[PDB]
Write a protein that binds this DNA or RNA. Sequence first.
RNA 1: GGACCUGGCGGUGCUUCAUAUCCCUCUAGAGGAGCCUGUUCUGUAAUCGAUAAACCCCGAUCAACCUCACCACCUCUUGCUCAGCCUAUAUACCGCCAUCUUCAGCAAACCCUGAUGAAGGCUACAAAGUAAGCGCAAGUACCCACGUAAAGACGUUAGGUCAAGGUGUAGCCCAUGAGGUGGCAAGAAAUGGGCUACAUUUUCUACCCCAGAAAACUACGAUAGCCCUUAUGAAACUUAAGGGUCGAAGGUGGAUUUAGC
Lengths: 49, 132, 165, 101, 569, 88, 196, 313
Amino acid sequence: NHHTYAELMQTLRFLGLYRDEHQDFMDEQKRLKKLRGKEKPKKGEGKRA
Amino acid sequence: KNRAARVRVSKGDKPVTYEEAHAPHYIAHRKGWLSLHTGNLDGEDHAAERTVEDVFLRKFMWGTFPGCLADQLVLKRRGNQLEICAVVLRQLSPHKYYFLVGYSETLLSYFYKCPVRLHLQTVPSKVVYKYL
Amino acid sequence: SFFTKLTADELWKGALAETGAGAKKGRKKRKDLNRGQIIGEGRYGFLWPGLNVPLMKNGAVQTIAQRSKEEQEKVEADMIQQREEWDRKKKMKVKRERGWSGNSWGGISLGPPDPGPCGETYEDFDTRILEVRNVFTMTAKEGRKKSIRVLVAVGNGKGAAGFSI
Amino acid sequence: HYVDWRMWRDVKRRKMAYEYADERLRINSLRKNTILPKILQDVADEEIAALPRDSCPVRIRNRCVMTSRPRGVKRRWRLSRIVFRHLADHGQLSGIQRATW
Amino acid sequence: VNRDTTAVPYVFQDDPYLMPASSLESRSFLLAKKSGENVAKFIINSYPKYFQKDIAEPHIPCLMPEYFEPQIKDISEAALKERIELRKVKASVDMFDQLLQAGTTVSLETTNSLLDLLCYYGDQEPSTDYHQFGVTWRAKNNAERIFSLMPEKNEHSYCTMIRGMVKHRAYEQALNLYTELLNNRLHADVYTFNALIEATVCAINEKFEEKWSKILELLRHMVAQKVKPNLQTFNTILKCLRRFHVFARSPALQVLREMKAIGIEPSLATYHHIIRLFDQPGDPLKRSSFIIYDIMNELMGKRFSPKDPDDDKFFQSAMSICSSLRDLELAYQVHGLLKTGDNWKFIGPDQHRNFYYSKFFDLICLMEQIDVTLKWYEDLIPSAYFPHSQTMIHLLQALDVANRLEVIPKIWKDSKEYGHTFRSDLREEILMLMARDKHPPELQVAFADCAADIKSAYESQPIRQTAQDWPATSLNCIAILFLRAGRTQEAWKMLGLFRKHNKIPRSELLNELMDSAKVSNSPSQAIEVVELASAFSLPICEGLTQRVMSDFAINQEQKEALSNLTALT
Amino acid sequence: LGISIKVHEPPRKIERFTLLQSVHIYKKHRVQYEMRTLYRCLELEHLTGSTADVYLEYIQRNLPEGVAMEVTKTQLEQLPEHIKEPIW
Amino acid sequence: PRRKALPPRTEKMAVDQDWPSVYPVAAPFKPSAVPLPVRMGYPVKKGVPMAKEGNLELLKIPNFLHLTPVAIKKHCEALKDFCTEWPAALDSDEKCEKHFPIEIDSTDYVSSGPSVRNPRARVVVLRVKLSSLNLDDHAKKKLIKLVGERYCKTTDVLTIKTDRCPLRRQNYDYAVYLLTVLYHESWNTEEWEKSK
Amino acid sequence: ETYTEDFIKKQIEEFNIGKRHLANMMGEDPETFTQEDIDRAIAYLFPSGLFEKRARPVMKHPEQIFPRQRAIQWGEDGRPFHYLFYTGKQSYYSLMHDVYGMLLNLEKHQVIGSRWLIKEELEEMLVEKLSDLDYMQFIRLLEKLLTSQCGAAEEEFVQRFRRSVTLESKKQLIEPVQYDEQGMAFSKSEGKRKTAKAEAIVYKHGSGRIKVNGIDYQLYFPITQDREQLMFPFHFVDRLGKHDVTCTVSGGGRSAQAGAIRLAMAKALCSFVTEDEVEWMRQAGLLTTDPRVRERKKPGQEGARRKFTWKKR
RNA sequence: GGACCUGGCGGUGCUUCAUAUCCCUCUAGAGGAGCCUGUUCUGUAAUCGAUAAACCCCGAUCAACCUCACCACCUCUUGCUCAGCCUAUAUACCGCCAUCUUCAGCAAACCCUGAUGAAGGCUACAAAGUAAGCGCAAGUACCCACGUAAAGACGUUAGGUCAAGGUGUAGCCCAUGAGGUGGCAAGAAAUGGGCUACAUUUUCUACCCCAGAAAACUACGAUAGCCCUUAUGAAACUUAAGGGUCGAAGGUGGAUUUAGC
Ligand SMILES: [K+]
Ligand SMILES: [K+]
Ligand SMILES: [K+]
Ligand SMILES: [K+]
Ligand SMILES: [K+]
Ligand SMILES: [K+]
Ligand SMILES: [Mg+2]
Ligand SMILES: [Mg+2]
Ligand SMILES: [Mg+2]
Ligand SMILES: [Mg+2]
Ligand SMILES: [Mg+2]
Ligand SMILES: [Mg+2]
Ligand SMILES: [Mg+2]
Ligand SMILES: [Mg+2]
Ligand SMILES: [Mg+2]
Ligand SMILES: [Mg+2]
Ligand SMILES: [Mg+2]
Ligand SMILES: [Mg+2]
Ligand SMILES: [Mg+2]
Ligand SMILES: [Mg+2]
Ligand SMILES: [Mg+2]
Ligand SMILES: [Mg+2]
Ligand SMILES: [Mg+2]
Ligand SMILES: [Mg+2]
Ligand SMILES: [Mg+2]
Ligand SMILES: [Mg+2]
């Protein structure tokens, strides 16, 4: 059950009991992309409108 | 050239443990297995289920004791008991180790519906077998 | 999926691309993301007795508690400030005493020679660079190989001086 | 949170195949014999053909449970050859070793 | 298998870094582990859907999530009974009010089951994972409100109200309610009388004769209503007479003989209350002697079962008297009774277990031979308990009386391993014994290795945040031990510490420093001794200067130096 | 415990299989793996049910990790009462 | 100051101690509790096998420290009270066959995991020699034709294997039922048998 | 990893204490506890199936574990002890100097079971690293010392460098001669050829009858070549029609079974011929087990040696 | 521009070699026929990748639907996911590998030579080299000490794979994402590998080796075509098996070329 494993470990990370190195890596990459101007658009407000 | 599970030669400054220093062709010759169960014996079942559980336990412990594990886990199964033997460092305070032991043993017992135990052996530093 | 995630070392080794054909014949920096993280601290702001908060308080064992929304905002904001300061220090550049010109090695001091094995010392000697040259040699396999040739001079300012390549 | 959309489609196929297994079995038994009248067997053919497509077990695919690779899978461990080797070559699969003889 | 004496209790992680090194860590390490288990259970019960995949065969009910929420959302009797089983005091009262306002009938058995919940917790919500002095029975509470609105009231209704009042220290109300039960021609149970006996004593403060007359009236009432007393009826009497002490000594023994005759078997709690009653501050030889001697002849070789909540307090009380009487033969009988069968599980919590062994071992060190004392020392510590710093001092005093001082270096090694490295009273005790008298060269060298390690403890204290403090006796002892061991170089260096901390040097230290100088024939050092004693204006200095003049050759500079100290003279 | 026991070693079994070595193409390059199953047979004779329950519980609890057991028990029974004679 | 680890408790052990008390049950190898200078590991050039502290290879081994010859002999002394005595009259296999002509075979499977289930455990095998049954000439001839390959003429043993029921007690009761209906039908004579 | 003498002295103290602990665990007398008992106890307590024995648990005396290290070569004053120190090969050249000096004194005065030690053995007597040419020079100088009229003093020295090259005897082992119920002498032996395994019983006296699995040999082996193999042993020693044989063979094909029977009968027949005749049978290849067995197929090729066709380019 | 150093290259010299190995020699083949299968071309509204040695029954230990990533049409928009993308870039990469390797070399730290230039460093009756470590070796697996496996460094081909999975950079977000229905996957032709044959050392039957028949237009020869039945499946002209019918090319294969001690 991939839903159970992913959801459980996501909850434990928000509870501060599990350190997800991979998720921390993804968060840092996404943070630096905002500062670089490459942010995800809002649904319906894409470059094509 | 083969790559699988080979720490490649460097300038002589890379410390490697005994397990990391042996390529796959030394399994059963100079190094043992990191998990022992009956699933892979002839005529035995549930090898697939034991494998998924092992992969999860290794990721769980890695993120539950961040920066503490000094070596790979040794997973042992006898009957319906699950023993987890880990070699950890001596940086965290003992109180936090006791909290994480009580927490992880209880959480894993309810997750896999079996009595789980965690045996910790502390070392002052990562045991170095050689410098590649 | 939880089973497709990898460790930080694996993720940095791939993203940095320090190894590869592009870095062999002249054909991004790592960041430790576990640096300022405290075991037990999470987004929900729970206070786990014995892990991220003291086990006993006023001689009694604490119970599971959770920081208020306002109190957790301060912790998050304080962690971002701690991150900027740590990063700011790295951007700070040291003031170099330039040599003959701004980008040249000539004239720059290298400090005293290293102390010998038998407790021998050379604190009285200063070292100066006179030339730095990138020499290239052709090899059968790798082709154009890059090396460094340096000329330095040493002296104690009292008549004893020498040079070496 | 499954590996990809293709694994998610196979998850749903295995779920629907499990729910209709008894019904399909009973209808198929009416078709797999020479005892019942043809008039009754022709009606059973139409009945099982009207069941949802994703209830048919031949549409289930044994994919790698960690990477969703549809081929090169070892049934005993339900892992693709690549993932299996990664675990085996690190000594994490009990009793499995390189073979030389 | 028997207990492993080299190991700590099995609950701790068997690892030199994770093993508790003191009685404080022995308590906190277990609380940290229990805290981690509570956090795991909090998560399991908060997110039960993650822990519902059951792969175990046979099924393990004790490894499934728990559901503390009511699942019946209809307003009816069957829905109220669910909130009573879950012990939802507030929801059950609300469900009861709404159910009552609607006009639907609520059975009597269910109304009683609601009083049992309110009367027990006092209209307060029990403790949960996460969402002393004084009376806790509020005037207007849901229990009394529901009790008055109650249409039909039976015996069980009054009983659960009387027991709830006494439990929450509303002794005066419980007695008033017991009068109504009698006026209504009802009969209470033994459990209701047990609470009334506790109220009769704790309601008002009076003399013993007045209280003892009311209790004997309840007991005679209990016989008129054909109610048989149980163990708790007599244990409550003995536990309530602890106030009067001497006045209740003979009456308390009448309760004990009353149990034996009726057929009720005294439990460990029955003798605990008799032990504490006779164990009043004073001279225990008059009575407490033969009371514990007769209680042990009765309990000899008996296996006990849990009958009363206070059964885990006897051994702590029995051992406390053995130390007061200073009777070691009696202490072995108490410890012998603790070792028969499974009696070892009645020793009590950790605080009671450490108190039991502290008194037991401190009595061994005092009254037992040293060869046997060191066998108990190895069997009990750390396997049974971690010693208090005062237990290590009682052990050193036993080695001194036995003339076995070669063990002192071992007691210091063990003291550090038990968390007593920075105890002032302990380091002073060790140094004084080692430096009390002179010993052969072999032993004198061993004491210098220990004094050197103790010196390191004074230097690297955690109080180092504060200015280092060196007791006067410690400095005089550490210095004398270096001289007697031949480490003169180390002794002369320490003389500066006497001036730094301004600590008076001992007369014996100054005299032995001279002997070390006359051996080395160093006049400067000899003057440095006279210079030190001169700073403190000791009378032996003036006489010592005369000794220095005759013993050592005095250079003109040295002679003028002594003249300068003679000028001070 | 006073149980008559014999021991022998049945022939081992080695299961082998082959896998590709590269993630892509390079068909003629494989890696081969194997699983070795070794056996040991303890044969006990003439023991009651109570003795068998104690011995089996003692050695089954002490079964090392990675070792499975298949215990075949041959029980002695008497003829059912209905079979001792023909009906007619 | 940081926490200093205590010295290993092997330094406190006597050479004449009761070892079974140290390792009473199966437990992983603990360097600080095993007073043996044991080493393990393929050594490097001009090196030695790695010491026991932090040695993962010694941790992988299923050790027998809890099953020393001294411990086994003490364990078995306490387990004698649970055993019963085999009948002395049953001295040989031929004597067991005389008094107990039926043999019932069943198998239990011990594996590692959370589930103790194993579908192979339901199988029951019943063996009996026709010489032990009260069969005349006609009945024994008819019984051999009914069972077919379940009978072996060389050994004269009838083997009935049952495994169509979920449980083993059901397959056992069914095996006894089969032996009963086979015995009573062999003694029954039909009219169509005259056409043999 | 340098090891001082104080470190080895501590390792020996631990081994003696641990040796008494191990004897206490196994319930044996600590005084008579030998190294063989230690190895047996360690194998039981720490069972390891690793194929390489050097990687298994071990508890040996420190002198047998740590490598022999050369002591200090100079004192506190810095003066080397040996007068050949500055050559860097004092042990080797000290030996060449002594051998050269003996060859001089002789001038002033005037094989099968042994071999010269190999270079790696000489590097252990000297505790130094040697070159291949350094080893040849030393051997050439010892051989020059044997050719001379070396005395007893010059003979004990050369033997220090001769190692025993024990030559195992090729003499065939003779099977015992047994007797059956009727008192007829016979011998028994076995033979293997490919996957065929045979066991033959050769009677001392007979008429030349051969039974294979209870069948006459010409009925069991209808192919003439197979019968020629059964004739080879008896005909080579001139004993056709003098013995009766009963053999059993299983596995393999017809020719492999005839080969296994040939080897089994030849071995059993050695009990009824003279020692010289047994050596002739050995030199005729009649007593050797044929080691030629099928070779496995390798992955990525068609057969054991056959490769796939190198595709046309 | 002059003179050198290193590497590469030479239809460059001498000397010695390759042990299934470059040539001849030995054995069976490929190249000619049919069929199976991959690829290229062509075709189609209708994937992708490999593609000299080192691609071509290769990713696939495998595609009727599914698989699937393709095409047509229709549908959904916080969407199985604190979204998603088999979108681009293997010339940003990890991971796993090909190749020389059917090799024996790689190399930190030093020392010395060349006037302290790029650079170079051996001669054993020895003349400046010492070298940890890595590889070879040794050990181990299989039936030996043999053989076969396994192993095989540093580097070479920006070699292969973003479509195992992960991932840097860039890009899409009512669509480059998600779902449903139906559909393509053919053969003018060329070519690689394989299978079956051309027969008498053969064909058929009995038997597993002492036999009887067959033997050129009813012989040898299709696993092809056509028809039928059966098996699996919800679904089969389509996939497999069996039977019937049918009885073709092929009569031993040029240049060239593969494998084996
Ligand atoms: K050139
Ligand atoms: K790559
Ligand atoms: K990829
Ligand atoms: K990418
Ligand atoms: K071809
Ligand atoms: K051809
Ligand atoms: Mg390869
Ligand atoms: Mg500038
Ligand atoms: Mg399929
Ligand atoms: Mg072949
Ligand atoms: Mg062709
Ligand atoms: Mg294509
Ligand atoms: Mg392409
Ligand atoms: Mg490409
Ligand atoms: Mg479709
Ligand atoms: Mg399709
Ligand atoms: Mg797409
Ligand atoms: Mg590339
Ligand atoms: Mg070999
Ligand atoms: Mg190979
Ligand atoms: Mg090798
Ligand atoms: Mg490329
Ligand atoms: Mg799309
Ligand atoms: Mg024909
Ligand atoms: Mg056909
Ligand atoms: Mg069908």
